[PDB]
């Protein structure tokens with residue numbers, strides 16, 4: 001408890017001790033920063049007054065890893081799991097069976113990306129503890145997760161960077177009030193976020209000889225696509241060409257590119273990023289609904305898209321990195337995709353003379369289940385993070 005915290009403190013560098021002191025004074029804004037820091041430009045990240053703070057605190061946590069799986073407790077907002085409603089008010093004592101089952105239906109068969117610093121407890125909160133929400137998380141952290149106990153009373157810091165699944169929910173009572181206790185698990189996934197260099201090494205390791213697994217026709221067609229053939233190919237797909245104006249030559253190229261993507265399937269759970277334009281979600285740059293600075297437009301977007309399916313007729317390019325790019329400066333929707341191990345796809349940026357950087361291509365006709373949508377501020381512009389899973 002407190003004694004652990006005083007022991008673990010000795011393991012910290014002076015800079016890490018310094019980061020922890022700031023955290024105690026500024027926990028809220030640092031945690032918030034730790035959740036969205038990787039979505040900005042590299043130069044915005046390096047300039048941020050809380051960036052050195054992030055790195056140091058990240059490092060401190062990694063110096064105390066657990067030797068076995070451990071359960072942790074913390075309260076969470078239901079909106080985190082795409083339940084955009086109160087389970088019950090603070091004044092109310094009961095959670096109805098209907099509201100319980102509505103929450104169950106919402107979280108069922110979904111994976112939820114969790115990120116950023118979080119204060120946890122090893123003990124179930126009781127009669128005299130802070131209970132901010134009606135939703136209590138009981139999450140199993142795997143062996144080797146960093147965990148930093150520290151004195152302020154005593155708290156424990158973790159850094160979330162994984163998907164969670166909710167295995168079971170139960171209605172419990174603490175101090176004459178109903179809560180939903182959620183038993184959750186960690187599903188791991190490779191997520192490079194802003195570390196594009198490490199993502200490149202992984203990509204090149206896994207796709208260096210991808211060309212040599214391709215037949216000559218497959219190789220020629222993939223080459224054609226990357227040399228600029230994608231415009232005609234994808235417009236044909238977007239425009240419903242196979243149905244309304246068939247082109248067998250194009251159909252043949254499409255088939256070969258699809259077979260090439262299935263040739264060396266994504267070897268692990270992978271998170272990728274796409275800065276989406278308005279037309280991917282049935283909008284335009286001048287659509288009033290595209291103004292996410294107005295809250296009713298975020299609600300309307302979530303109402304249409306959250307919990308729903310999105311599919312692309314075209315081949316879909318994504319990145320192993322989450323950072324913003326000037327080419328995408330005016331895009332407001334960041335698509336954050338989990339790609340299950342064994343899915344079609346290829347790191348195209350592993351091909352010697354290819355101009356594209358950090359790029360993973362996904363198969364045409366791909367479908368994504370949107371688990372959860374978040375908003376964030378990018379300067380004055382509100383932007384959206386769409387937490388999606390490729391369903392192959």
Ligand SMILES: NC(=O)c1ccc[n+]([C@@H]2O[C@H](COP(=O)([O-])OP(=O)(O)OC[C@H]3O[C@@H](n4cnc5c(N)ncnc54)[C@H](O)[C@@H]3O)[C@@H](O)[C@H]2O)c1
Nearest residue numbers: 238273274275276277278279280312313314317318319359
């Ligand atoms: N967008 C990303 O985050 C991303 C990531 C990695 C690589 N790239 C590559 O960067 C280059 C330029 O980026 P880009 O995104 O403008 O190229 P793109 O070909 O992906 O997009 C072209 C335009 O049409 C779009 N579009 C794509 N699918 C659509 C659909 N199903 N319905 C309607 N419109 C659709 C986009 O919104 C955009 O306005 C491309 O070569 C792309 O492959 C992009």
